[PDB]
Design a protein around this ligand. Structure first.
Ligand SMILES: *C/C=C(C)/C=C/C=C(C)/C=C/C1=C(C)CCCC1(C)C
Ligand SMILES: CCCCCCCC/C=C\CCCCCCCC(=O)O
Ligand SMILES: CCCCCCCC/C=C\CCCCCCCC(=O)O
Ligand SMILES: CCCCCCCC/C=C\CCCCCCCC(=O)O
Ligand SMILES: CCCCCCCCCCCCCCCCCCCC
Ligand SMILES: CCCCCCCCCCCCCCCCCCCC
Length: 218
């Protein structure tokens, strides 16, 4: 398990860089007025690239710092919401949602960090899990409500974005509780890494697809 976890960190590091530069190179494929979300998606992957380089070295040392993962999350999750919410809102509606979801994400990630750095299975560990879970469900329920009236290609493209988040983000609570289901400390790290690649590279790809649709592309 330890070597598999190291190899996955090293592969995910290159994967995040690849996501970054692919998204940048792909921005010419959409109209200028729809490139912003592609650039923000690339920024998300680029921040992750920086942190994954650190995480792989941290894991390789044998004294692993999950604070590298959580600081990556606290910066990148609110950014990922920026372009999700831009599809459905602008102006005052957008500002309020971006702020409120960002605050919620910060509470979720902070509660997770509090719990994960507690003794596994302790009351503190479960407190962090339960607070994070409730905030997570609140976020997902807000997300499900966004874009309900959309029709056509833009509705399909936005539902693909929504469903990637609704399904793909389940991996994180599974990873968090993997160490109490078995001798699986490393499996937590495996699951977080797989989740980040799927969710960050995947969301960038779907935001690019959303921008092609908005560009009038088939
Ligand atoms: C780019 C990274 C992303 C999208 C990270 C998302 C992480 C979360 C959805 C984590 C949520 C957690 C819970 C729902 C409960 C256990 C604690 C967390 C923080 C792992
Ligand atoms: C805690 C410190 C975090 C440091 C993160 C550094 C990440 C930098 C990686 C490359 C980002 C490049 C993404 C392109 C930015 C948007 C594109 C554009 O503006 O034209
Ligand atoms: C129990 C509810 C907690 C609410 C948290 C409120 C704000 C906390 C913000 C998120 C912190 C996540 C980043 C922590 C990692 C850095 C620590 C380190 O590097 O040593
Ligand atoms: C473990 C791995 C689980 C992976 C789960 C990923 C879920 C993806 C959901 C929807 C993605 C929509 C893509 C639309 C493409 C057309
Ligand atoms: C460390 C504390 C981090 C608190 C949240 C920071 C969010 C940064 C990204 C904001 C993007 C626009 C909403
Ligand atoms: C391990 C394979 C998981 C694949 C998930 C892909 C999600 C994004 C699809 C974009 C097209």
């Amino acid at each position: 398990m330890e070597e598999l976890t190291y190899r996955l960190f090293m592969v995910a590091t290159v994967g995040m860089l690849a996501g970054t530069v692919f998204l940048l190179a792909s921005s010419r494929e959409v109209k200028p007025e729809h490139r912003r979300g592609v650039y923000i998606s690339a920024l998300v992957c680029g921040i992750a690239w920086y942190h994954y380089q650190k995480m792989g070295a941290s894991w390789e040392s044998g004294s692993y710092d999950t604070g590298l993962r959580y600081v990556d999350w606290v910066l990148t999750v609110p950014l990922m919401f920026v372009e999700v919410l831009a599809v459905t809102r602008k102006g005052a509606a957008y500002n309020e949602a971006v702020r409120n979801w960002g605050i919620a994400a910060t509470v979720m990630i902070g509660a997770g960090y509090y719990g994960e750095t507690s003794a596994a299975g302790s009351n503190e560990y479960w407190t962090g899990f339960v607070i994070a879970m409730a905030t997570y469900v609140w976020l997902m329920r807000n997300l499900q409500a966004e874009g309900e009236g959309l029709k056509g290609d833009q509705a399909v493209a936005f539902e693909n974005i929504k469903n990637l988040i609704l399904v793909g983000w389940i991996i994180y609570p599974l990873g968090y509780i993997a160490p109490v289901v078995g001798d699986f400390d490393a499996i937590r790290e495996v699951l977080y890494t797989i989740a980040d690649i799927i969710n960050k590279v995947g969301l960038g790809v779907l935001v690019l697809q959303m921008a092609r649709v908005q560009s009038g592309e088939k």
